[PDB]
């Protein structure tokens, strides 16, 4: 499973879209979106995500670098279509390798829902979607931010 | 939420019953059961459970002190009535205070299911049951182990 650490996380369908906390805004419910890289080599802090892992399981918290908002399903409403947002508290996620290259699904534990990017349009908010076998938009790649 | 550490866990409905790994058996799929305290004052290692926590969540792993088997739902079959067993791999659980005091429900994350002890007979296996706020069979007291 992915080692704890700090990553740029890019969509597999839309490889030029990173997970990005809108406007580096620390406010609750700020949306999390798919957005072009906003600074080389690894973006500002709002496109870097630190993963903390529960040993011997695939459960993690994801926290941005700056501001330090965690990834959270808005209002803890774990249903299809629900928005991902920046919050002072995280939603635990299950990050699971897809049979793939170094590709992963970021899943809501035990619900069969996953983070998806529904459009390549820049700034498209990321939402939950149903886990499936053929959609690449709920597939994600992780790249370490250089120390 | 509960502080990480090593605990004896006693049922609320049946106060002479602790979560216990059958016969201190290290084998996979060994039943977890309700059973009287097997040693004073904190039982042997099969009745002592170490909790590991993912910070800022209520998700945890539970592992016996000896042998070191984790608490796992049989075949990761997260449905009503499924057996709890020891395994080399854990089922992440959500340990949530049930108001009261020192009382907690050990729930399956995001599902309406929780560990429950259906009878005070010695060695009755612990199994998942639907979450039910009024049922003491799925309530648990946690006492730090002095040993
Ligand atoms: C609404 C908003 O936050 N707009 C801009 C913000 O302007 C704030 C003032 N008024 N408005 N109205 O300015 C930031 C910083 O330039 C800007 O942030 C970018 O937002 C995009 C999505 O639109 C993406 O999140 C970028 O990564 C982000 N860049 C930074 C550095 O935060 C925001 O859109
Ligand atoms: C038979 C065997 O291989 N193990 C038994 C063990 O046998 C001792 C030999 N016969 N004598 N006197 O005996 C213990 C009971 O003392 C037994 O372990 C207990 O099993 C129950 C449920 O069946 C429960 O898990 C108890 O906590 C457990 N106690 C300990 C200390 O492991 C074991 O199966």
UniProtKB/Swiss-Prot annotation, chains A, B:
What organism is recorded for this protein? Clitocybe nebularis (Clouded agaric)
Q: What does this gene product do?
A: Lectin specific for terminal, non-reducing N-acetylgalactosamine (Gal-NAc)-containing carbohydrates including N,N'-diacetyllactosediamine/LDN (GalNAcbeta1-4GlcNAc, LacdiNAc). Specific also for carbohydrates containing N-acetylglucosamine (-GlcNAc) or N-acetyllactosamine (-Galbeta1-4GlcNAc) at the reducing end. Agglutinates human blood group A, AB, B and O erythrocytes with a strong preference for group A. Agglutinates bovine erythrocytes with a very low specificity. Binds carbohydrates bivalently, which is required for its biological activity.
- The N-acetylserine modification is found at 1
Q: Where are the transmembrane segments?
A: none
Q: Which domain of life is it from?
A: Eukaryota
**Could you state what the record's PTM comment says about this protein?**
The N-terminus is blocked.
- Give binding positions for a carbohydrate: 20, 23, 38, 46
* Protein keywords: Acetylation, Lectin
Official protein name in the record: Ricin B-like lectin
